[PDB]
A paper describes a structure:
Curli are functional amyloids that play critical roles in biofilm formation and adhesion in many Enterobacteriaceae. Two outer membrane proteins, CsgG and CsgF, form the core apparatus for secretion and assembly of the curli structural subunits. In this work, we show that CsgF forms a stable complex with CsgG via a 1:1 stoichiometry by lining the extracellularly faced lumen of the nonameric CsgG channel via its N-terminal 27 residues, creating a secretion channel with 2 constriction regions for curli subunit secretion. The free C-terminal domain of CsgF recruits and binds the secreted nucleator CsgB, creating a growth point for further addition of CsgA subunits.
To improve the resolution of the cryo-EM structure of the CsgG-CsgF complex in order to accurately locate side chains of 9 Asn36 residues of CsgF that consist of the upper constriction region of the CsgG-CsgF channel, the purified CsgG-CsgF complex was proteolytically digested with chymotrypsin to remove flexible regions of the CsgG-CsgF complex that may affect the stability of the complex in the detergent-containing buffers and increase particle heterogeneity on the grid. The resulted protein sample (denoted as the CsgG-CsgF20–59 complex) contained a variant of CsgG that includes residues 47–252 in complex with the most N-terminal 40 residues of the mature CsgF (CsgF20–59), as confirmed by mass spectrometric analysis. As expected, the 2.9-Å cryo-EM map of the CsgG-CsgF20–53 complex allows us to ascertain all the side chains of CsgF20–53 unambiguously—in particular side chains of the 9 Asn36 residues that consist of the upper constriction region of the CsgG-CsgF channel (right).
Numbering used by the authors:
A (entry chain i), K (entry chain h), L (entry chain e), M (entry chain b), N (entry chain a): 20 to 53
B (entry chain I), C (entry chain A), D (entry chain B), E (entry chain E), F (entry chain H), G (entry chain F), ...: 47 to 252
Write the structure that this text describes.
């Protein structure tokens, strides 16, 4: 069928439910300190 | 000599419409065969199409011509000699016999630490039946079913990792490509016309 | 000799449409039997189909032919000898008598630590009734009901475990395959035509 | 001798459609009785069905035959002797008088530590009324109401426990079976035809 | 002697459809009275129903009979003596005058520590009006309104307590029973027919 | 003597349908007045209703009677003497002039520690207009508007407190009662008929 | 003397339907003026309404009367003297010219510690146009627009505070009152009829 | 002298319906101009409207009058002298040419500690075109477009602060005012009629 | 001299409706050109429009005039001299050829600590085609396409910061302005009429 | 000399509507070709279009002209000489043969600490078929399929970082640009007309 | 209008959103210990 | 009206919102230790 | 009526609301340590 | 019926509710330290 591009980030592109998981999975791998 | 061919209607007998978010009344296939087919027959150097789809407009215009110059007063340069409606020896019936959405979908998406990328593809399938009919007898001289796949793919990539202690770099690159169903329907109709031509050649006709 | 057969309409009497997300008006079966059937009869070397579905187009085109060459002025090479509308001794009526969605679904999905994989399948079922009718008497010479299953499967696999302390590797590979309902309807119609042929052979006819 | 029977229309008088997610226009029962019934009467060795559903197609084809060979020019081998439309002494009227969704649902599902399994079942019910009508007088010779249950079950099993400290094993096996409503409608129609046959036998007729 | 009765149409004048999740076009009552009523009149040993619902099919079939044997060439064994359309002295009009959904719902559900169980019931109500009409004068000889309740109940039970420190036992047993609206409509129609019979007996008629 | 009365149609002029979850096409009032009214007039010992709603069925049946016995061959016992269509001196027109949903809702629910209980009620209102019309002159002899309230109540009770340290006792008892709109419409029509009777008595008529 | 008045149709020209949750087809105003108006004219002691809405039923019934007693065989007591259709000198046209939902909503709700209470009100507005037309000339003798407000209010109160340390007392008392739109439409029509009467009095007529 | 004016139809050519939650079929403007306009013309002391909207009812009533008194038997007091249908010299055509929802919305809401208050307003706009047409020639004598704004405002206030340590005082006062679209349409039509009057005065006519 | 112009119909050929929340049947453009155009032609001092849209009303009114004064009895002052339907030399055909929603949207919103403010704008575009047609020959004398942008903007501002330790001041000021599509359609039609006028001037005509 | 061309109807045979949030009835392409095409043919200096779309309006206006001046009384200056309906030698049939939504979507969005920005684009595709038909013979002289892409892009940028300890600066700038489908359809039609012109030039015609 | 009985508990009768509040309000009054 | 059997547990039978309350109410009565 | 197989896990099969309860009820019975 | 491929992850493929459970179930098995 038709495929339409959508951004995965709620930042720049619309779907807001992704951001909660995105920030958590980016903090689950944030190996930086100080 | 080129063969006169009369295409009346290539109906969209698929019965399919588009799924959400599309409108409920938005058909999956253009209702505009008999124009892709007339163009395929004209662009193949074998046929001369006759109108037959818009024949009532042609008959009303011929009524207007006939009533404009029946009194013999029209300027003899801009009078239109109506000869007679040219007739076809064969007639191409047909339909869009089927549209299948996602006969083969698929996708692979990987994502290491932060950086990720996915691909997706869907194959629709559109089938067109074309029948060369013998207008003298009504017998169906030939009938072909041509199928064409409609590829729609999508590639995305993205970064969501941290660059510094409290510095987050997000990024996204996306691309999508839906093969036009009108282009694939035109391709199926052109292949069906090639098949009808080669068949009429390969047995007696043409 | 080949038997002339007149297929008027193979109606989609299933009454089914597609479920969400598909449109409410998107039928589950193509409305394009009588073109799959005419093609099945033509491609079997036993029958010559006559138009009968598009007979009004043929009759209008024969009106145009008849009015183009009734004045005896048409060039004697490109005049079209209308003989008479060839008639059929038998007539194939029929319908798509039923479409069942998910007569047998199923699926097995395992997932150990991180790595997982699942399979899914759905079987639809489409049934086609084909009747050979004796045009002389109106009696139904034969009637067959052919069923065909439509398999739609889907295999996915995925990884979502951690590779290092704070390094997450996600991955996904998916594949889907929906058997076209037009292909399965064509298969059911071809099997029904084979059955009608062998039946007409096995008792007197043909 | 076999009895000629004229089945005109076995209408779907149930008024039912399918519930969500199915389309709003997707009927619960096939609109394709009069083809399951004509097949049930043909496959029972007692009746010869006459077309009557598609009689206009038969009459147009007989018009075409009659106009093709009225000039006495048709080749004497491929001319079609129209005798007359064979008539039926009885006539089978009827309907699908009712479809009940979930006359009896149920299910049992247990789940101990991690490992679980459930079963579900739904029984629909389809009722068909068949009337043998005396065409001479119009009197309804016999009328039967046959009911048939449509079983749709579903068995699932699954594991979601931990195998090690931080090792989670998930697993799922599912199976579903929906009895086709077209198969159950054909079964109800066949039982109704058996009843009509045995009734016509058991009192005078047949 | 048995009384000829002409049932033309028992219309579904309830105006009701089914609530969500059912389709918007799915009526609450079968549109198939006049077949439940014709069967109720036939199965009562007092009446002989005449077709009248499907009378156009009967008249077309009698046209076919009459045109098949008007030339006196039909084989004298398989010619059909049309006598005349048998007429009824009375006529049963009627309707499904009302369907009320949930005239009385209810339910009791208890749940102690872990183990729980509930019951639910709904009573719909269907009312049918039946009128015996005097065809000679048009006067309504009798008119009855029969009501019938449609019970739909549901019993569930379940366990969700812990058996050990970290061992959770879940369990569920469910049963549902919807009384078919076609069965309850047939019961209301049969009771109405019994009432019409006893009324016609109790005053002069019959 | 009993007065012949001709009820043609008591139309549902309320324009109302049922709110969600009910279907959008499910009317709030039965479309089956003219059957509740004909029954109310018959069951009152003052009137003899004449068909007039189903008069075309009666006229077709009288055509069948008249054509069955015009040749004087019908057995002299089972021939039907058609006298003439009995005519009415008055005629009861009318409508369901209005249905108001929730003209008065309300409810009181208390809940102490754990144990709670609530009551709810809704009053709909249905109004029926009945007109006695003088068929000789066309003048409306009388016109009454009868209103009837439709009570729908609901009582629930429940416990959700703890019995021991870690022992939770849940419990629920519910009851609902919707007054049938067909019963309330029949009650309004019966009251309107009583009023029409007493009015025709109280001034000259009857 | 009382004035004969012919009310043909008081159409619901408001174009409004009810908002969610009501059905999309559920009009905001009853489609049953011309029955509220005929009743308002009859109940005012100034007019005699003539049918005119149901005139085809009256004409069919007069056909039946006329055909029942044209042969002079009807019993001389129960024959119906048809005089002629009484005609009106004036004619009341009109419409429901507008329905406004929530021309004025409002509400005040306070809530101290635990105990709270609110009030809500909505005013709809319905306007009816009534025209007295002179049937001799066609001129509109008078035309009035009557408006009526439809008040719908709602009062609730509730307690949700704690009575003891761990004892919670919840309580709720609610009342709602929707003024029937049929009652307010009848009130607007009655006021419009009073205005038409007083106007016809105050200038010559009546 | 007063001018006879014939208003046939003032159509709602705006094409607008109301947005959610309103029904999809609920138009934004009443379909009841030609009654607001006939009333505006009557209430202006310049015109006498003639029916023309309901002219078929008037012609049927005149048929009834004419057939009631053609035999010369009607009582000479209650016979109705039909003169002839009075004709208009001018004719007011027109439409509701547009409805714009929220041409200007706005709102200001402040809220300090606990106590808050807001205001909202929406302006719709309705435009009406009125044409005075010369019935002798068909020429449009005058054409005006009148616009009218429809103000709908809403003021709310509320308290949600704490009065004591654990004492919460909530409070709310709301008011809403939607200007009726029927009142604003009547105002636009009255202004358009004033303009047509002053225009016909200011150039020759009237 | 002023040119008589006949505007029959300026159809809304845009095919567009309004998006959610608006109704599905609420068109994006008024269906009320041919009234904006007739007004634009009248208000330009070059044309006299003739009715042609409402010509059937004019012809019925002329029938009424003609039948009111054919007997020569009408009072010689209030008789209406019908001359003949004035005819136009040119004819303005046309359409609303397109409505694009959001050809250019945009917005900028800043927000520092607490205090914020945003602006939004949308530009729709409406295009109107106007054709001056030569009624003598049927040739299209001129054809213009005029486009007009419809600006809809919105400015909001708000405060949500704390003023004291536990004192929160919220505030909001909003304004919205949607340019009426009827005003922009009238502007496009007026510009198109200006263009048609200047074109007819600039080549021979007018 | 300029060629008279008769454009009857350029139908929107794409079958497409707009997806959500747009209305379900809002077509994806304007229904207003035959006005873009007539304008493209007029604005190209090669053709004179004749009305043919609005020919019934032209014929009614010519009836009015003919009946206004048949009595020879019209003022000899303002009488309209009807010559005869000018006829076309060629005729441009055609359609919008297809509209594909998002044949190529895409987007790139980056976001460093706080500051981010994205771009999006969608390409629709609209195809138009134009056929020059020979009115004398009915043969299709030429047929072209012109495609045009419709670019819709969107650029946004935003800041959401902290400027001080507890000071948050948010900001957003957005821009969107949807290419009008009416402009792209006009461009495709103009390119198709250029192709038809150059083709008619390049072989004999024109 | 029509009234249909529904259970308030998600346990035995369907509406699951009630249970979150039900268990909390039963624990807000749970005066048992040990 | 029609009644259709549905499982109350999200485990084996579909409605997932019930599980949050179910596990909490099973843990509110879990009197086991060790 | 028609019955269609759906996976209960959001892992491999679609319904995501089940997973929150599934992982919690698997952790409410996770008797493993170390 | 028709089957259409959808990604289970909200990362690359759309359904965002899966991610909350996915990250939790990946952290419930994350046996890495340091």
């Amino acid at each position: 069928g038709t495929m339409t591009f959508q951004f995965r980030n709620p930042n720049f592109g619309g779907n807001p439910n992704n951001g909660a998981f995105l920030l958590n999975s980016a903090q689950a791998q944030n190996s930086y300190k100080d | 000599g080129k063969i006169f061919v009369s295409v009346y209607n290539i109906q969209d007998e698929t019965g399919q419409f588009k799924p959400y978010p599309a409108s409920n009344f938005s058909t999956a296939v253009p209702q505009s065969a008999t124009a892709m087919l007339v163009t395929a027959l004209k662009d193949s150097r074998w046929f001369i199409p006759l109108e037959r789809q818009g024949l009532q407009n042609l008959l009303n215009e011929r009524k207007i011509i006939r009533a404009a110059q029946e009194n013999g007063t029209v300027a003899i340069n801009n009078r239109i000699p109506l000869q007679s409606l040219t007739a076809a020896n064969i007639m191409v019936e047909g339909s869009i016999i089927g549209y299948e959405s996602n006969v083969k979908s698929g996708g692979v998406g990987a994502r290491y630490f932060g950086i990720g990328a996915d691909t997706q593809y869907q194959l629709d399938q559109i089938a067109v039946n074309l029948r060369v009919v013998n207008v003298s007898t009504g017998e169906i001289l030939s009938s072909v079913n041509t199928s064409k796949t409609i590829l729609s793919y999508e590639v995305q990539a993205g970064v969501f990792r941290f660059i510094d202690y409290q510095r987050l770099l997000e990024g996204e690159v996306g691309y999508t490509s839906n093969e036009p169903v009108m282009l694939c329907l035109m391709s199926a109709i052109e292949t069906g016309v090639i098949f009808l031509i080669n068949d009429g050649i390969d047995r007696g006709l043409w």
